[PDB]
Design a protein around this ligand. Structure first.
Ligand code: CL
Ligand code: CL
Ligand code: MG
Ligand code: MG
Lengths: 327, 327
């Protein structure tokens, strides 16, 4: 596999790193949404299922009705719009919530919807509230980044283990990252994301893939008819939780030789704290506000590293691309 | 403050650490339950509130009823017993649950009960299932460790900032650690624990101390009449969430010069990954089995730090005391 869909300087660096680190027990970590593919799985699957009338205020787990709905005589507030209002309280509210909102469905069912969504290829209209007025928006379904697909594979081929650490529900992400049809070929056990309790509707048994994996009894097929529940397992794989996830599920001491992200706060803990001294920070720049945020973080963290007596690595080996460069 | 309630050799090592690090912007992190005071706040407050008839099944937030209660015609299953069955599923189930179970009380009501619990002094009878057998125990309310009270204050007097990172509800822990009455004198903003959304029923606002503290706008008095809800905020402050909490709320690069705990799995990440190269691992050895597990882990991490190119510090500067020695 070769790095076709990459700017050549980006390709040279990745090639250097891959070559330097081949077959030595090394590993890499990718965020998923807007990093491994363009756009956002949950943020499109949610308004997609609403549109299909599958996911409605009526079926939403009561534990997720955290605030009153904002209904106009004209209009019932959508789940999508409710989500946006949850994020205005805080990221730490709406991040779990937008994974939990898929509770009530079995994995088989969600898998049908993900693939439906993945093949949809049209924008999905969603309504929200710009302050007080009903605004509207089209949300793109996810689009595989050819470059990431290639890099995932070339890493694997050179004996570099590939992990996904995602702020999205681990089961949803796995439905794309680990299904060969999408071409990433991640190992399903190597997909790490937001985990909620899965419930056996016959026995009442509660389980999660992370527990099965830690116990060495993971069977993905056996989980298909389990129902997603909202109850949150941890580490919650966002912000410092991404670094917690690496320590918990990957390695306590060995650092990834490559970390990929796109959201400065969500991905910055694993980018800055996780990435090995000589590893690459892979960055999908999709937004100026974000590019600026991460540049200030590079400056603050480089100075803090020096002040703390650590080698300055926060500013080393950035490989920065835009979505269009790797599509 | 003198370290009077310490064995003399542990007093000297702690004194040496303090003198080397005094007034230099250094910090220390303590677990609370079984490390800062003897016994366990939530595990005693729960059956205390049950015995009082204040906290019952019908009061339990609905989202917390994860599995059927196991009643025999003679006996109704206690919430304490229910908690222990949740732990048998996984720690990652019963840790959040045993903080969340205090949902539906305001901070002020909970403070009244905590002070009550802290003044009661006697063990609290409770029942749980020993597989299928109804089994019995007496749960001890927390007992302030005089030595830890001294060490918190001696750190602070020497310009070593003290933090609590506890897997108990942040607000419950703050009710002990930051109330001058118990003598630890932790700053309330330095108490880091399990956080859940707090509801102001007057204004509708959902907030947390963590949120207020990061916005630079925290007043503990302001929150007293907010209701605890179960919605989990993160980082969740156990296991790797403790290390995630250090990074999120304390410092991204500077490491604590002392980390204290007592539970090998839940404290192990901050103990091993958090503790500064030169810092002290303060261990409160309450159970031979845990003492054996921590020694095992030191071996394992010493060797893994070595196999990862790092200076071996896992086995360095252990100050190990029993509850009886610092009581
Ligand atoms: Cl993310
Ligand atoms: Cl703990
Ligand atoms: Mg992303
Ligand atoms: Mg403890």
């Amino acid at each position: 596999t070769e790095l076709e869909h990459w700017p050549a300087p980006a390709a040279r660096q990745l090639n250097a790193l891959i070559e330097a680190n081949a077959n030595k027990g090394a590993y890499a970590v990718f965020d998923m949404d807007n990093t491994s593919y363009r756009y956002d799985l949950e943020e499109s699957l949610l308004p997609y299922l609403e549109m299909k009338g599958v996911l409605t205020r009526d079926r939403l787990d009561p534990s997720l009705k955290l605030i009153p709905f904002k209904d106009q005589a004209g209009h019932k507030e959508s789940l999508f719009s409710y989500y946006y209002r949850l994020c205005e309280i805080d990221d730490m509210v709406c991040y779990p919530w937008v994974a939990q909102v898929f509770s009530g469905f079995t994995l088989r069912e969600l898998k049908g919807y993900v693939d439906e969504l993945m093949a949809y290829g049209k924008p999905i209209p969603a309504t929200y509230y710009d302050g007080d007025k009903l605004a509207t928006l089209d949300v793109e379904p996810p689009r595989v980044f050819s470059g990431q697909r290639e890099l995932y594979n070339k890493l694997m081929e050179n004996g570099i283990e590939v992990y996904v650490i995602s702020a999205a529900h681990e089961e949803l992400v796995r439905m794309v990252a680990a299904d060969p049809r999408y071409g990433y070929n991640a190992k399903p056990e190597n997909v790490i994301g937001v985990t909620t309790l899965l419930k056996n509707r016959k026995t009442g048994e509660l389980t999660t893939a992370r527990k099965q994996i830690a116990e060495g009894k993971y069977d993905p097929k056996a989980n298909l008819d389990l129902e997603v529940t909202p109850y949150l397992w941890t580490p919650a794989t966002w912000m410092a939780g991404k670094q917690a996830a690496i320590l918990t599920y990957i390695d306590r001491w060995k650092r990834p030789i490559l970390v990929a992200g796109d959201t400065p706060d969500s991905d910055g803990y694993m980018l800055f704290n996780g990435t090995a001294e000589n590893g690459v920070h892979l960055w999908v720049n999709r937004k100026a506000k974000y590019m600026e945020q991460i540049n200030g973080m590079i400056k603050q963290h480089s100075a803090a590293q020096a002040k703390a007596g650590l080698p300055v690595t926060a500013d080393r080996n950035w490989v920065i691309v835009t979505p269009e460069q790797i599509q």
